Ligand binder design. Structure first.
Ligand code: NA
Ligand code: NA
Ligand code: NA
Length: 199
C-alpha cells in the first residue's frame, strides 16, 4: 500500500563497506526470524536500497508492525559495525499503530547515547579498532545500555573516540579507573563523563 510506505521503511547507517543489497536483506530477514520478531511466514524485508557513496541503506518491509519491531535492532553488529537504525525523517506515526518496538533483542546495544549524568567519553582510541572491538573493550567492565564510535562520514574511518552509557551507572567509575590515562603508543586514553569536556 502507498499510504503506509513511509511507515514501512527504515534508515540504516554505518553500513559495512562493499555490502550488497542481497546480503543486507538476508541478514535482516534472518535476524528478524531468529529473534522472534517476524509475524508471518515469508520474508519481512522486501527490498534494500544502498547508497554506497554515502554509506547508508533504506530497508522496506512488508508490514508497519514488523518495521516498528525492527527498530529494536539499532546497534546490531554486522561485519564489525554497529548499524544505526532510524526512522526516515519524514515518518509520521499512523493512527492506532505503535511507534516503538515491543521486543528486546538480546545483546544488541543501542547507538543512541543521550547526554546524561553518566554518559562517558572515551578519547584516544586506536583508529584501527572497529565498533565491535571498542564495544568489547567497554563491555569488559559491564553491559552497555548504549554506545557509539565516531567515524569520519566521508571515509568511514574511526575518529578515535566514542561515547557510551553502562546499564549500571556504578560501572562508569570502574571503567574510568580501568581505562583513563592508558598509554597506547602515541595515544593516551581520556575516559571521563562526557559532560566534563563537552564543547
Ligand atoms: Na561508517
Ligand atoms: Na558517508
Ligand atoms: Na541524520
Amino acid at each position: 500500500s502507498q499510504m503506509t510506505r513511509q511507515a514501512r521503511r527504515l534508515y540504516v547507517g554505518n553500513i559495512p563497506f562493499g555490502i550488497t543489497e542481497e546480503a543486507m536483506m538476508d541478514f535482516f530477514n534472518a535476524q528478524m526470524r531468529l529473534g522472534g520478531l517476524t509475524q508471518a511466514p515469508g520474508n519481512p524485508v522486501l527490498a534494500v536500497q544502498i547508497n554506497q557513496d554515502k554509506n547508508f541503506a533504506f530497508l522496506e518491509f512488508r508490514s508497519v508492525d514488523e518495521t516498528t519491531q525492527a527498530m529494536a535492532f539499532d546497534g546490531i553488529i554486522f561485519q564489525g559495525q554497529s548499524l544505526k537504525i532510524r526512522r526516515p525523517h519524514d515518518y509520521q506515526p499512523l493512527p492506532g499503530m505503535s511507534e516503538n518496538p515491543s521486543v528486546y533483542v538480546p545483546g544488541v546495544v543501542s547507538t543512541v547515547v543521550p547526554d546524561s549524568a553518566h554518559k562517558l567519553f572515551i578519547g584516544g582510541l586506536p583508529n584501527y579498532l572497529n565498533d565491535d572491538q571498542v564495544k568489547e573493550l567497554l563491555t569488559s567492565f559491564g553491559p552497555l545500555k548504549a554506545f557509539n564510535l565516531v567515524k569520519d562520514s566521508a571515509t568511514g574511518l574511526s575518529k578515535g573516540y566514542a561515547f557510551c552509557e553502562y546499564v549500571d551507572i556504578n560501572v562508569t567509575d570502574q571503567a574510568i579507573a580501568g581505562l583513563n590515562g592508558m598509554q597506547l603508543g602515541d595515544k593516551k586514553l581520556l575516559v571521563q563523563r562526557a559532560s566534563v569536556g563537552a564543547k
